[PDB]
Each structure stands twice: as C-alpha cells, then as structure tokens.
Amino acid sequence: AIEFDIQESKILKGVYIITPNKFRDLRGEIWTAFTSEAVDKLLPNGLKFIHDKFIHSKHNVIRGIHGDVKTYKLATCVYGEVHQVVVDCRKDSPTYLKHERFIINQDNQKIILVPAGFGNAHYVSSETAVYYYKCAYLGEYMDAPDQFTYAWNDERIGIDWPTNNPILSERDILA
Amino acid sequence: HMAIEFDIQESKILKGVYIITPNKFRDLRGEIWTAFTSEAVDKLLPNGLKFIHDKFIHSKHNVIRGIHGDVKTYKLATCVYGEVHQVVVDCRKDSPTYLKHERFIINQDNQKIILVPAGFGNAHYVSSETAVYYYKCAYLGEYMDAPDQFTYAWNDERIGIDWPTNNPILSERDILAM
Ligand SMILES: Nc1nc2c(ncn2[C@@H]2O[C@H](COP(=O)(O)OP(=O)(O)O)[C@@H](O)[C@H]2O)c(=O)[nH]1
Ligand SMILES: Nc1nc2c(ncn2[C@@H]2O[C@H](COP(=O)(O)OP(=O)(O)O)[C@@H](O)[C@H]2O)c(=O)[nH]1
Ligand SMILES: C[N+](C)(C)C
Ligand SMILES: [Cl-]
Ligand SMILES: [Cl-]
Ligand SMILES: [Cl-]
Numbered sequence: 001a002i003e004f005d006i007q008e009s010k011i012l013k014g015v016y017i018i019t020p021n022k023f024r025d026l027r028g029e030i031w032t033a034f035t036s037e038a039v040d041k042l043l044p045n046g047l048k049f050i051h052d053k054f055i056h057s058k059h060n061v062i063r064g065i066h067g068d069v070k071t072y073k074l075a076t077c078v079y080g081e082v083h084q085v086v087v088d089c090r091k092d093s094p095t096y097l098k099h100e101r102f103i104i105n106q107d108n109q110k111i112i113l114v115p116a117g118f119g120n121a122h123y124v125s126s127e128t129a130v131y132y133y134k135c136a137y138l139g140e141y142m143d144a145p146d147q148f149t150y151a152w153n154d155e156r157i158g159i160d161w162p163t164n165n166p167i168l169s170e171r172d173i174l175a
Numbered sequence: 176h177m178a179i180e181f182d183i184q185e186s187k188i189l190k191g192v193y194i195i196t197p198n199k200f201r202d203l204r205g206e207i208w209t210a211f212t213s214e215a216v217d218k219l220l221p222n223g224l225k226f227i228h229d230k231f232i233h234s235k236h237n238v239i240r241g242i243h244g245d246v247k248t249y250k251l252a253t254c255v256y257g258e259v260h261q262v263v264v265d266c267r268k269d270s271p272t273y274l275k276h277e278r279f280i281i282n283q284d285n286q287k288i289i290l291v292p293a294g295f296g297n298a299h300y301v302s303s304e305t306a307v308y309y310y311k312c313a314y315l316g317e318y319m320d321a322p323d324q325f326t327y328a329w330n331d332e333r334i335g336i337d338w339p340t341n342n343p344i345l346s347e348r349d350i351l352a353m
C-alpha cells in the first residue's frame with residue numbers, strides 16, 4: 001500500500017511533515033510524493049494543490065526566503081540533499097519569524113507542507129540537487145514581483161545554515 | 176521576471192499523446208520551471224478527469240522499467256534529473272494503432288513532458304549514470320497497482336522499440352513478459 005506518515009509541527013501549526021514509504025529493489029526506488037486524497041485534505045477551505053515546480057541548483061546555492069499571502073507549498077528534494085527551511089512570515093502572528101529546518105535526502109524523504117504567509121527556502125548541501133514543490137492557490141500564480149523576500153541570514157530569524165557565503169540571486173541579496 | 180509557458184503539441188499518429196515543453200528560468204544558480212498546472216494540463220484529459228497522484232522513480236544506469244499500463248490511468252511523464260528514453264505504446268488490442276509506439280529522449284535541455292493515455296503502455300530507459308523520472312497519474316477510485324496492470328515485453332518484436340542496450344536491468348515482472 002502507498003503510505004504517508006503525516007505529522008504536524010509542534011510549534012508551527014499548519015506545517016505538516018509528511019513521510020512516504022518506498023519500494024526499493026535492484027533498479028533503484030519508486031515512491032509517491034502526493035495524492036489529492038491523502039494531502040489536499042490537510043489544506044483549509046477546499047483548497048487544492050494545482051501547480052508542480054522543479055528547481056535544479058548547484059552546491060552552496062540558497063533560494064529564499066520567499067512567500068506570499070495565498071500560496072501553500074509542498075516541498076521535498078528528489079535528487080541530492082537540501083536544508084529545507086520554513087519561516088512564519090506573518091508579521092502579526094504570535095510565532096512571527098520562528099522557523100524549522102529539515103535535512104532532506106533519499107534516506108530522509110520528508111515532504112513539508114508550508115502554509116500561505118510562510119517563507120520557504122532551501123540550501124543545496126549535495127553537489128547538485130533537484131527540489132520539487134507543489135503550489136496550492138486560487139486564481140493567478142503569484143510571481144516574484146508579488147512575493148515577499150526575507151534575507152537567508154536575517155538576524156531576527158537566526159537560521160543555522162551550513163554556509164556563511166551562499167550563491168544568491170540579486171532578489172535574495174536585496175531581500 | 177519570466178512568464179510560465181507551455182508549448183502543447185499532440186502526436187501525429189497516436190492521438191491522445193501530448194508532447195508538452197515548458198520554458199525555464201536559467202541563471203548562475205541553475206534552473207526553475209513548471210512541470211504542470213491544472214489550468215493548462217487537466218483540460219487535455221477527457222470527461223473532467225484530473226491528475227491526482229505524483230510519483231518519482233530513481234533508477235540506475237541501464238535500467239528499463241516497462242512496458243506497463245492499465246485501462247483507467249492517464250500519465251504525465253518526464254525526467255527531472257539525468258536522461259531517459261521515454262516510450263509510449265498503444266496497448267489497446269482492438270485499436271487501429273495497436274502496438275504502434277513513440278520514443279522521446281528527455282533531458283535537462285530537451286524537457287519533454289509526455290501525456291500518456293489510459294490503455295497505453297509506458298516505459299523508460301536510463302541512459303545517464305542515474306535518473307529521476309517524474310510522473311503524475313489521473314484516475315478515479317483506487318490506484319491501479321502491479322496486479323491491476325498489463326505488461327508488454329520491452330523487446331516485444333511486434334513493437335520493435337530501438338533501445339540502446341540488449342542487456343537492460345529489469346524486474347522479475349519485466350523479464351517474465353519476454
Ligand atoms: N510505496 C510505494 N510502493 C510502490 C509505488 N509504486 C509501486 N510500488 C511497489 O513496487 C513494486 C514495483 O512496481 P511496478 O512493478 O513498477 O508497478 P507500477 O509501479 O505500478 O507500474 C510494486 O509491486 C508495488 O507494490 C509507490 O508509489 N509507492
Ligand atoms: N519559466 C519559468 N520561470 C520561472 C518559474 N518560476 C520563476 N520563474 C522566473 O525565474 C525568476 C526567479 O524565480 P524566483 O521567483 O526568484 O524563485 P527562485 O528562482 O527560487 O529565487 C523569476 O523572475 C521568475 O520570473 C517557472 O516555473 N517557470
Ligand atoms: C482532448 N479532449 C477533448 C479529449 C479533452
Ligand atoms: Cl518558494
Ligand atoms: Cl536552524
Ligand atoms: Cl508506468
């Protein structure tokens with residue numbers, strides 16, 4: 001049977017930590033990252049994941065911290081290893097700028113549900129990585145100009161990244 | 176900023192097979208791209224069906240997986256790391272195009288996404304040192320697992336696929352079909 005272990009974050013309610021089972025053999029492995037039946041149920045108000053994205057990045061890249069008012073995400077690493085970070089970026093939240101970090105790889109296949117209004121980021125600790133995330137929203141995709149950005153090393157968040165000198169976009173330097 | 180786009184083409188000989196090519200934003204860090212939106216891709220399925228299931232297959236060099244299909248499951252397949260030869264086969268015994276096939280080479284620079292109809296066989300070969308194969312499934316009701324599926328031999332002479340190897344790495348299921 002295709003299985004998910006579904007846990008909720010202790011501190012950051014709305015953050016789900018989902019672990020799939022896998023079939024492993026002489027060929028490699030097969031696994032399920034998502035079913036609507038298991039995972040859309042976790043979203044509020046009948047929302048559904050409706051968008052799939054891939055990010056292929058080199059060693060020591062950070063992408064983040066990115067979010068917007070409406071977009072839920074479901075994120076994992078399907079090749080290599082990342083440090084996956086979620087941040088509560090709701091300024092009026094009692095848990096504003098609290099965060100959680102996960103080291104995601106083939107041996108620790110955590111899939112993180114990131115609420116709307118949370119910031120999302122990852123660091124490539126492998127030589128290369130392929131990051132997978134689904135997006136749930138109504139209406140039009142929120143592109144970069146319509147998103148907020150927090151600095152990867154914002155002192156108020158205090159993420160313990162394995163780098164002091166990541167490779168960054170101009171967006172992620174300007175934050 | 177860059178706009179998310181798809182180029183959507185239908186196969187000439189195998190109607191129902193779509194070849195979808197995304198754009199990508201490529202920079203100093205690597206690339207970001209969209210494999211699927213419901214708005215662009217679910218409308219290609221018949222009768223209100225929707226993709227509701229996402230799967231990953233991480234395979235070693237020289238593996239073949241296939242040829243597998245079932246009577247209800249539509250698939251949307253690509254390779255998100257490395258390189259595969261992706262093959263679709265019309266496996267409907269009463270189809271005018273029964274055992275006709277199409278082969279696509281999928282890699283980072285040729286990011287084809289193949290919509291495979293229900294009743295079609297699916298297969299891929301890993302030409303890179305390793306590959307991650309991504310596919311979505313659209314069906315109603317319970318997932319169609321191995322016992323629910325049909326199986327055609329990778330080297331079925333009636334299909335005549337041109338594979339790079341005579342020595343693919345196979346499961347017992349895929350060997351049994353020979
Ligand atoms: N946990 C898990 N197991 C799977 C999955 N897909 C297949 N399996 C198991 O792994 C074996 C290999 O599957 P396969 O023969 O390729 O059938 P198919 O994957 O349904 O086409 C099957 O016997 C399944 O029980 C999956 O997504 N998750
Ligand atoms: N073609 C395509 N371009 C994208 C996609 N996502 C983002 N972009 C573009 O790539 C640029 C960088 O993406 P951004 O939103 O900063 O996310 P990041 O790349 O993870 O930092 C933006 O200016 C977008 O216009 C996508 O899915 N497809
Ligand atoms: C292409 N379609 C009309 C079957 C949806
Ligand atoms: Cl993001
Ligand atoms: Cl931390
Ligand atoms: Cl398949």
Ligand SMILES: [Cl-]
Binds near residue numbers: 278335336
């Ligand atoms: Cl061929």
